[PDB]
Amino acid sequence: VKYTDAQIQRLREYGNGTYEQKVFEDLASRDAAFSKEMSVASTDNEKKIKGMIANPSRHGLTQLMNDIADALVAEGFIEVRTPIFISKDALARMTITEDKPLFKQVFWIDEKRALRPMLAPNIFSVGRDLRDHTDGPVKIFEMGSCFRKESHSGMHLEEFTMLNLFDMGPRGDATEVLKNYISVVMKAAGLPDYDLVQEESDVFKETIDVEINGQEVCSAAVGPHYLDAAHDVHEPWSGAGFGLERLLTIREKYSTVKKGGASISYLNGAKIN
Amino acid sequence: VKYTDAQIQRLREYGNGTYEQKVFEDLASRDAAFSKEMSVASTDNEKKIKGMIANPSRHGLTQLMNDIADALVAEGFIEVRTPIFISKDALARMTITEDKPLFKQVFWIDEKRALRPMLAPNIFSVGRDLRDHTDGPVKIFEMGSCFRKESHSGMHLEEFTMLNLFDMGPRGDATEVLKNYISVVMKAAGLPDYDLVQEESDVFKETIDVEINGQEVCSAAVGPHYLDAAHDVHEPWSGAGFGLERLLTIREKYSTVKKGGASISYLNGAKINL
Ligand SMILES: Nc1ncnc2c1ncn2[C@@H]1O[C@H](COP(=O)(O)OP(=O)(O)NP(=O)(O)O)[C@@H](O)[C@H]1O
Ligand SMILES: Nc1ncnc2c1ncn2[C@@H]1O[C@H](COP(=O)(O)OP(=O)(O)NP(=O)(O)O)[C@@H](O)[C@H]1O
Ligand SMILES: [Mg+2]
Ligand SMILES: [Mg+2]
Ligand SMILES: [Mg+2]
Ligand SMILES: [Mg+2]
Ligand SMILES: [Mg+2]
Ligand SMILES: [Mg+2]
Ligand SMILES: [Mg+2]
Ligand SMILES: [Mg+2]
Ligand SMILES: [Mg+2]
Ligand SMILES: [Mg+2]
Ligand SMILES: [Mg+2]
C-alpha cells in the first residue's frame, strides 16, 4: 500500500519532500509513516521560519525577479511597469472578444476594464509608442502580477507573476534572437536545463514554449505576427512570457506553486500557520 | 495674470517644470508663454525617452523599492509578498465596512473578494502567524500594488504601490520605534527632510502621517489598538504604510504621481504618446 491521494496532498501542503513513491507493508505502517512525515515537515517549517527570523532576506520571488531583471538590463532592455487594469479594446486586439468562452475567464472590474491576464497588451502598446522615438530596436520587459480564473492545480494560481520581454526590430533573425534571450533568462533563473516545444494556442495559434520535465514555464512567439496589425506593429520582433512562480517552484523543488509566491499561508516555501 | 487651472493641468501632463507660480503682464503674454513651455516640455520628453533607450535601466519605481527594501532587510525585516485579493471578512476586521468612505473606494472582484486597498490586513495576518515561532519582535514588510477608486488628483492613482512595514512586539516604545524606522525609509528613499503630523483616520481613529511640504507620503499607527482583537494581536506594534509613487514623485520633482508609476502613457517621468 502507498499513501492515499489525500495523505499525499496533506504532506505536500506542509512539506516539500517526495511522498508518492513510498510503499508500506500494511495500512498501520502507512499511517505511522504519515504521522512521522507530518512531524518532520512541521519541524522543517519551524526551522526555516526561525532561520528567516534570525537571518532576514529579500523574498525568494523578489530575488529571482532581480536576478533576471538585471540580466535583461545588461542585454539592453528597458524595464517598464504598466497598469494591472486593461481595457476591453486591449483584450480584443489579442482576439479575446466578447462572445468567446475565454472572455468570461478574465476578472472584470466593470463593463470596460478587467485585470490583465497577460502583460502582452500593455507591452505591445508601450513598445509601439517607444518606436516613435528611436530608429533602433525597442527592448522592454516587465515583471508583474497577472490574473486568471483557474481550476485547482498544483501549477496554477489566480494571481501569478509574469515576466514579459519584448524586442521589436531585433538585430537578427527573430527566432534565433528569441532563443538567445530565453537562454539568458533561464540561466539567470538558475535553470539552464530546459526544452523548447511548439505548442498549440488559441490566442497565438502556436507558441514556442519552454518546458522542464513537461511543465510549461514560458510561452513565446516571434514577429511578423498576425496580431501585429491590431497593434500597429510593422517589423519583426521577439517576445516571451515566463511564469516566475513556476520557475521558482521547479528550482527550489517546492511541492506546489503556492509556496514560493504571494501568500498568507506560506513564506519562502514554509507553511507559517 | 496667471495660467488657468486647465493650462496648469496640461503643462503638468507633458512637462515637469513648475508653472503655478508664473505670472504674466497680460493675456497675450500668458498665451505665448503657454506654447513655449509646451515646446520646452515636449523637447525634454523626447530627450528623456532617447536617453532611456541609449541608457536602459531598471524602472525608477523599482530602484526606489530595492533601495528601501534592502535598508529594511538590513534592520532585520523579512520581506513578504501577499495576495492582491482580500476577503470581505478581512476588510471588515479592518473596520472597512459599508459606512466608511474608504469602503466606497474598494474595487470588488465578486461578492466576497476585493482588490486590497491597503496591505495592512495581510500584514497583520502574516505577522501574527510568525509570532508563534519566535520570542522576539516580528518584523516584516511588503511592497505591492493597492487599489482605490479616486477622483482626478495629481497625487492619486487607482493603482499605487504601498510599502507597509510591521514591527510586532517592538524593542522600545512603539511610537518611538515607529519614528526610527520612518527615518530609515525616508533616508533610504533620499528624502531626509520631512515632518510628522497627527491626522484623523476612519480606520485607525488616529494616524501619525509623514509629510513633505505638507503632502502626505505615509500613514502610520501603533498598537495596542482596537483593531488588535480581530487580528488576535495581544502586544504593542509599529506599522507604517508609504506611498512609493508619492515618494518618487517628490524626490524626482515630477509634476504628478502618474509619471513615475505603472503606466502606458509615461515612462520614468516622460510622456511617450499624445
Ligand atoms: N494560473 C497560472 N499560474 C501560474 N503561472 C501561470 C498561470 N497561467 C500561466 N502561467 C505562466 O505564464 C506563462 C505565459 O502564459 P500562458 O502561456 O498564456 O499560460 P498558459 O499557456 O495558459 N499555461 P497553462 O495554463 O499551464 O497551459 C505560462 O507559460 C506559465 O508559465
Ligand atoms: N490613491 C492613491 N494613490 C497613490 N498613493 C496613495 C493613494 N492612496 C493612498 N496613497 C499612499 O498610501 C499611504 C497610505 O494610505 P492611506 O493613508 O490610507 O491613504 P490616505 O489616507 O487616503 N491619503 P490621501 O488619500 O492623500 O488623503 C498614503 O499616505 C499615501 O502616501
Ligand atoms: Mg509527492
Ligand atoms: Mg541577486
Ligand atoms: Mg504576457
Ligand atoms: Mg492556462
Ligand atoms: Mg500549457
Ligand atoms: Mg502558454
Ligand atoms: Mg485617500
Ligand atoms: Mg497598508
Ligand atoms: Mg524592534
Ligand atoms: Mg490625506
Ligand atoms: Mg493616510
Residue numbers in the entry:
A (entry chain B): 3 to 275
B (entry chain A): 3 to 276
Paper text:
To develop MaPylRS for encoding MeHis, mutations from MmPylRSIFGFF (L305I Y306F L309G C348F Y384F) were mapped onto MaPylRS through alignment of published structures and sequences (Karvan et al., 2007; Seki et al., 2020). The resulting MaPylRSIFGFF (L125I, Y126F, M129G, V168F, and Y206F) variant was evaluated using a GFP production assay and its activity compared to the existing Mm system. Efforts to obtain crystal structures with the amino acid substrate MeHis bound were unsuccessful, and the active site is instead occupied by an exogenous triethylene glycol from the crystallization buffer. As observed in published structures of MaPylRS variants, AMP‐PNP is coordinated by three octahedral magnesium ions, which in turn are coordinated by water and the sidechains of residues E218, and S221 (Gottfried‐Lee et al., 2022). The flexible loop spanning residues 150–160 adopts a similar pose to that observed in AMP‐PNP/ATP bound structures of PylRS homologs. In our structure, the loop harboring residues 199–210 adopts a “closed” conformation, plausibly due to the presence of triethylene glycol positioned in the amino acid binding pocket. Remarkably, in addition to its increased efficiency, MaPylRSIFGFF also displays enhanced specificity compared with MmPylRSIFGFF and has negligible activity toward the histidine analogue 3‐Pyr. Consistent with our in vivo assays, MaPylRSIFGFF can adenylate MeHis with a rate of 0.59 ± 0.05 min−1 at 10 mM substrate concentration. In contrast, no activity is observed using 3‐Pyr as a substrate. Similarly, regioisomeric amino acids 1‐methyl‐histidine and 2‐pyridylalanine are not substrates for MaPylRSIFGFF. These data confirm that the increased selectivity observed with MaPylRSIFGFF arises from the specificity of amino acid adenylation rather than downstream transfer of the activated amino acid to the tRNA.
Transplanting known mutations from a promiscuous Methanosarcina mazei pyrrolysyl‐tRNA synthetase (MmPylRSIFGFF) into a single domain PylRS from Methanomethylophilus alvus (MaPylRSIFGFF) provided a variant with improved efficiency and specificity for 3‐methyl‐L‐histidine (MeHis) incorporation. The MaPylRSIFGFF clone was further characterized using in vitro biochemical assays and x‐ray crystallography. The structure of the C‐terminal catalytic domain of MaPylRS is similar to that of MmPylRS and MbPylRS. MaPylRS lacks an N‐terminal tRNA binding domain that is essential for activity in MmPylRS and MbPylRS, and consequently it is inherently more stable to purification, more amenable to kinetic and structural characterization, and provides opportunities to produce proteins containing ncAAs using cell free expression systems (Gottfried‐Lee et al., 2022; Herring et al., 2007; Jiang & Krzycki, 2012; Seki et al., 2020).
